[model samples]
Target chain A: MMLYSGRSQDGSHLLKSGRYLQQELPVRIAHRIKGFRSLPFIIGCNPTILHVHELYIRAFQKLTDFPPIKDQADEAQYCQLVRQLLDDHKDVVTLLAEGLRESRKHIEDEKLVRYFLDKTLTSRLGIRMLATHHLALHEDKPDFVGIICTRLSPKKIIEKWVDFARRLCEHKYGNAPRVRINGHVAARFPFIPMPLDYILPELLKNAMRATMESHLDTPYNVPDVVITIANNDVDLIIRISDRGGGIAHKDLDRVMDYHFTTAGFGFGLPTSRAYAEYLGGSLQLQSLQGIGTDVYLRLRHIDG
Target chain B: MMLYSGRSQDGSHLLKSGRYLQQELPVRIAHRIKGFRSLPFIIGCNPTILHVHELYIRAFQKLTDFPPIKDQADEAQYCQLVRQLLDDHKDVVTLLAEGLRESRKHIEDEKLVRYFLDKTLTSRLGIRMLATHHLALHEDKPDFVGIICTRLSPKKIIEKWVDFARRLCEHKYGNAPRVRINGHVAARFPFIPMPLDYILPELLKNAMRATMESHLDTPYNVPDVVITIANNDVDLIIRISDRGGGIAHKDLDRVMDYHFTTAGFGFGLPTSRAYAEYLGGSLQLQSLQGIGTDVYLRLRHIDG
Candidate 1:
């Protein structure tokens, strides 16, 4: 590839020369680069200025999605404008990339990268909040799921889960319909997956409250229940299913989509999905009309 | 204008009536409707059902401001389609609206409406979660803003508001400088209007924190400030102005948009705007960069 290098007033040290090259010769060499469609130029702009601008836009975008960007015409036109700008400044990007690389070589500072990433992740999206408070509390090593499953209790497990679920519900949904939690387990580690309990109860509680109160006259006694763990394997699976006449099949997929709840705040199912995957497990759901529904949390056996 | 109404046996009232009429009648009436041209005429179908299906589609279309057929091709199209299915039954919406109306109509019984509306407002929003225990015991028109705002001792207020601004900075500028709350007040009299202290300090606190750290390049300090009130003829005009650098001209207009925010949860300003309007008042914002911002709260004073 044709290549060129130009140094700013601030020295540009090449890997070959380990020193600043402020000479005009590098400017000429830059033009010869195949990707250098234009002469490389620096108009006394601070590199940190652009960095600040990048961080600003990135930060704003992270804080909130560009708000549904209702203007397709605007978006299309913006894409075109950005393409033009990039074409006009291809050389600048190449130079910036090179400069960035030069800076990275000597920095060798993984701690800096980790710190910024951690700070960014933790302070925004409430993700870091969850990670720090709950994820951090968990031991880093993987445990054998089978052993954890065998030691589980279906009754007390669900009762505690229900208590937490009710607390969270009351926190968000005041006067929410009484959330009744119950579960049945079979065999060793019978109570499905405990993680599933953490995830689905919060989700189902919100879903049932937001949807129009069903006019169906069916008497739903076990409006909320979870059943997990069966037979021999240490399948630490959990299934916290609600009794709200199982969300109409048509609404099933819709329920999983982010921001789909009417109350306007929920991260339950998505968090559960993440937790299930995190534990080397999976959350499975099944439902039938008139009989309510079931969720399965299939967790691999935890090794001692 | 022509109007028609009917009921569906197992459907929404409006939809069934529309369907029943559309069924026996000529195809000409169905054709007159703009949205339902493609719907096939089925035997034994109800007009109320069809009409409601069409209307549910139309309300969603209006909500999104989608040109007749263009937006139907978007991601929101599916949601609109589902709402049609759930809400299109003839009597459903009418029943729900009727139930809500009955509940509200009962509000007029012996000052009950004011009490219920006040109670419902606080419960739904948690505006009164922190008042003295005695405050909860009394049957007073609770000062929700008072209860919550009072909990913010200047130091704690600074911490919380600073934290809020910092979180916003992560969204707006990747990082926020430390900011302190200089002053705050919660004073409202019979003739003075506006929750000035309740709302504007938060906004200015943001601007102050942002400007002090990023723009002024100085340590953050909250200057002693005062929020004033004055009574005009038949109106309690409240002005919640701050001495901090006022907002830039370009950004002023976007402040009240639901999804717009200087800091970006998308709800803060709009919620404030709605609160003002709900209390028979309006928020008027006047700002000058490098100078300061003035927010006016105008409320109508009713005679005893």
Candidate 2:
């Protein structure tokens, strides 16, 4: 229960307002809404959006298939991709779209960026953008990445991101885990099913970051992370323990504070924390610097 | 207020267990759970499934001309058709798929037939199915038609379905109602936020049958047969005042009873009622045979 204190409104007040209570929307949007004190109490708003997209995809799938039959596989894959994007970002997209619309200054830019981002993220290019960010640390320019999120496609949803994810693996752990990296579609939120890649790199990235930063030969292992879905909640928890030292008695509360940095760039923890909380959920790290650090993040269901 | 009597154990138990309630997989699987009791829960899951297909078209709209840019004048027109087909045959497909799977036979043939039917319903050639079915009714096949409930796509979510939907309308509805439709997604169940075309022809055909046979016109007007979504419950209430003498007091409940039909088919009321109750909802009709008859169907949000 510690909540963000950056705003004047009480965190519990926002929580009750459904600022990010997440009946459904994208994670990024949900996170951004933490600052807003009002909400739309729409039921299954997230899943309804996904279902609409599902119908939208099917209707267009065959009409535009160049060779028709060849596109069958593509159509199926595309449907799966859209579903997965819904799984991953429905709330975030909704949250971001709403946030941009309701924000005070530069509403148009936020709106433009949100639309483009929503489109890219829902499309294939969007998957690549997320993967690219996960791998390369190079922040070239303000707009180095375009609207990939909103332009996503099935080929792009699950197909195009493997290599990018792999590059991320090599950079983080120096080697990919010796196991099958499977990608499949399943529901993350109630009534909202989508494709989810069994991202070994993503798993490794977290593992690598935790161990290197904590200086623990082994921090959280594969066994420590679990992903399961029931109702509208899909939870992925990552636990890392360090032997470096126990949390200093005085710094326990300060450990997760904004601008708080224990590792790379000094912005990683806070930024990651921001991302985690943005999804109408939370990210918690229990660390004993000389002992261990456990990071836990809960992802909400895509279906409202 | 009446819950469908449970007969077999399929996905209904799964739905009740809340394990797959959010995903509808369990409910979908429950429909296939090899028992009658679970049939209702899973019976309508396909439309929810096909609804996802609609989203794919929107996701990939910008990348290819398959789904044109939203600003294109023709986009909304096309989307309406997509919505109509999806709503119309989702149940038909779900039942057919369920039957084939249950028979443990001819799934491939059933799927092939389904593909053909799906195309007939989705392509420009689809309307021919309507004409063909009408003509086929002269043979033994029989022409079947019913009501199609619809909703408007919210401006936010409409962005997701507009393009493909535009093409769908061009391929099907012939652009008449396209202009009449607004940019908002409507639904019967709060569990699923997006509009479901589940009741289109089935409901329409039923209404057409009622109107034609009963000499009543109710569905053509909005509130005559209104569909309302409150909290997450979707209810369809149709009011029809008969010019003929009112029914005998004793036959009030008997009218909607199973197998009690004014038409030779013994289907109209029973099947419609069944469809309503199957989705955790109901189908009710009020008849003053001499004065008026009102039929109402309510569907609740069964998915998480």
Candidate 3:
């Protein structure tokens, strides 16, 4: 089998990144286990929370029981464990949201609940990133430097998402607004692409939807969604702007609130924000009621 | 002499507003006093918090001890108490910021501190609005409405602040960028102008500073600061945008952070945001790093 052949046939091993990930992942898993145990008795007992708790235990137990990943065969097998955990935890945010809702009656302090969820999801982000980074380092792609990071083009990323999201909007609304891209052609940096992959599209949809909904009665000349990216070596700031009569001032807080839902998007802005925050980045929205809305996405470049 | 004349010679009294304030001010003051006592012991012990606490007590005692204002003379005396209390509490925000800083070591939770301060400032705003509205309603001024509301020209407010803030920027930087006003000439709304008075100038200064600083190196063609207002009957969204190369993405959160101080301004953006939020409005910032920044200020009409 291919798994059995990795040690000799591939003639390559995990070597440097492999050894580091081998040491780091178990500790990360252990820390999460500790976090799960730290939850209050009632919150921890929620069925969805218990589901997540069991997964953490399973991953932690598997990683700890394995022998040190010394060769390609071991690394390959270890990667399978990481991949399985990654797939298993894909719905983790949804699970937490459901669990927290169920436990809401028992929770008296809103801030404490927020603090717990923020810290938990962020940790989930960190652990998943480590696993994915370990997996990604094995790829021979030209842009990838090491770990999970890649030499990326911000403008290119925007262009791609613009097309994809407009398609999504078109499918749903039977119409989608034109989008104009703006950024320096030469702005490239090393960063993890996973967060961007998630963040860029979500914002694209938010902007596209606003444009469509705001112009529903106009029947013509729906204004274009404008995406602009500005970057220096240290960081990048991307603005997605739309002329969708914006949101009411009262709804600013609710747009990113976990308790609210909009545009039929499952995860919403809060999840996007958690992803951005976990990576030491920021997400913010600014709107001109009766005019348009602008969402800013800022991420610092990864430097090893 | 003027106070004595108001009962007969001036031929004006608070009337409807007087009756409302006579009932409302004491209740608002009492609620704040309750709020002060609800702070955690360590936070309450901080000198500045204690200072605010004592002021609330004094205001509550004065307002509650006074007989209901049934005539011009009673209203005049009541106005003095309200004015004195307003003057005494002008530095309440500074005091709270200083107090919270002092209690930082004793407080284990950051969100709790923010929640407490938000609730306190909002309540303070409510009480102050009642007093000020009561005072403003007593004026024989045209365009005045009861309960401190005004049929305000949003454009005029922006122009006045533009000139004042430009002067401020000129005085500080020796060069203030040109600012162009944009809004419908006929657009006006009934709203509390005090919050706008505080909020507009703060944002104008912010926009002007960014403009001046961002273009410091350029010898000519400094970009103009743009102020735009969009309103439907329900709300007004005022935007102050600058071509100042925007802010670093990392500093987004810090811009509104109470713990951080910038530009030698005493109150900072957090105070501006608190004011806006208290009035059921919202203040938000969207920055394009390496390009410019936009600040959105939205306030709804006060329909009594």
Candidate 4:
């Protein structure tokens, strides 16, 4: 046996970590079943449970035998393996949820049962993230061509702002509103797109929602949602301002937490902030209560 | 807008984390594409990239609209959303992998390209698991029945052991070896089945390989691989003993850390230990050089 060196070392670490999750999943699930004994046996639960067990066992074996990424052939095979494992994981998660739901109905100590269940699920995050961090470190080289170097055109993105606004308003309000979308971009820029894409729509949604609601009694055309994109050598700055009723000063701090949302989960703002931070960027909100809310997204450019 | 309290807080956190990943992924991808200007533009890369982009956007929107788990109905809808999100995630991962492979071939600096691709792929695991944690917690009760109480029949597993051994041996050697499997369980124990299912086959495979190779020159009968299962009020213990050339003392430490293997990856032991730990259990390997190895697996019971 030879010690796997260099990149393979990282690959080996990842496979080992993935295998850990693969092997531990069933045991964790088994722990959850204790609370289920008092409930009536659900019909669809057993088969799905068995099926997930089978899927995980298969995934574990696959990862256990996974080859280190040394060349094109190895990388391709590894990707295929990851895809299969991911697919299996999705199936297992859905089935597990089903089984948990069935069992939950029968448990008398619902709160206690739910607490343990959440604990079991939440505890795995540590192992999962630990594995991911090592895995990411393994590919920190400059040539890594996956997500780190993928690019998108800001011009193309802004060009579609009107369409995006229409779709977003329609999606949110069943009926599309007469909303104007204005955009200003200083120049063409190629940058990683997802983080922007992630926050942009949410921002647009908020802006449009605000503008539309604010003009409800106006009996006139709704105010426009204005988007401005400017980039210097160091940072790409995007400002989205709307004439919607602005955030109340008292509610500003609560907005980023699990509070303050007409969107139910109150996750939009917090999630947007997380994306901004992940990119070494910032998302800031400014409001004048009755006037409007303005969101500033500052994303650092690659060279900067 | 209202503050989401209780379990919804955890769920909100999960969504926020997931959104961050969703947002960050594109930016990372954009960074990867920058290196591509010097290389030929690969034909298949764009579609996959856009497809993945679309998938993430849709998933982001779905999570944005995800209802909090306030009651059974809310929980049910959330589960449905998770199922859809997980399904979309599988697609995105596969597409990203494809795009990575495509980009890798066009880049002259293959090593660097591969490294970044791996990095990008690995970094997403943090957010993916964060989302899964929340989604899993959302079902903290109900049909959450996958792994928790699943039972396995030791008799059935043992019955299939011989076949598994032959296939493994044949898979390794061009021909199948004669092998016997013996099992002993004091009574029927329906416990968490996966962790055991995960490691048992690999152990058997190793045992059969060892016994067959050890007797190759002497033309002796291939020995039976023996398995013993015992349980008390607190723990389930499994012992797998094999008359294979045992690991040397000098190589013991190296065996578990990405080294010392005929099994390529050398992940079997380390991964098994992880499962053991996850279950509040342990796996110990004892081997006498050139004689045999005995492996013990201890899994704590839920009540215990």
Best-matching candidate per lDDT: 3
Model 2: lDDT equals 0.33
What lDDT tens digits, residue by residue, belong to model 2 across residues A1-304?
A: 1111222233333332222212212343333332221223231134543343443344334223323223234434433443444455434434433433323243333334333332433342233333233222222333222111222222233233345544564576554322222111231212111222422233334444444444434422322222211121143322222223334446667654433344422323433444445444455544323333334444443321
Chain A TM-score of each candidate structure, as shown: 0.40, 0.32, 0.88, 0.57
For all candidates, the clash counts are 45, 116, 0, 40
lDDT, model 3: 0.75
Q: How far is candidate 2 from the true structure (C-alpha RMSD, Å)?
A: 30.9
lDDT of every predicted structure (CA atoms): 0.38, 0.33, 0.75, 0.54
In model 1, which regions exceed 4 Å deviation? A1-150, A167-197, A203-212, A215-231, A262-264, A289-291, B1-304
- lDDT, candidate 4, B38-137, per-residue tens: 3335632477765665565665556555544455555556656666666667655455545554455565765554344334343344344334544554
Off by over 4 Å in 4: A1-65, A85-151, A159-162, A171-186, A218-220, B1-304
Expressed as tens digits, the lDDT of each residue in A19-127 for candidate 3 is 6767887887787788889888899999889999998899888878888877777878888887887898888877888887758568777666666777777777777
Writing each residue's lDDT as its tens digit, candidate 2 over B1-304 gives: 1111122334242122221112222223232223322223333244542343333233223223333323323333433443444455345434443333334232334334333323322331222222232222222221211111123322222233333443443353232112122111242222222122333323333433333333334222221222221222223222222223233456655655433445433334544454455455565543323222333434454432
Q: lDDT of model 4 at residue B67? A: 45
Model 4 chain A poorest 10 in a row by lDDT: A1-10
* Candidate 4 structure quality by residue, lDDT tens digits, A1-304: 0111224543564455344444544454444344333333553246666565555456556665764445545544665565555554644334555555455555466554334333433333322333233334346645332233334555566546656867767676554344432232335554655466657777777777777776766525766666655545556666675757677656776777522475434546766776676556778875535456667777877642
As for candidate 3, its clashing pairs are none
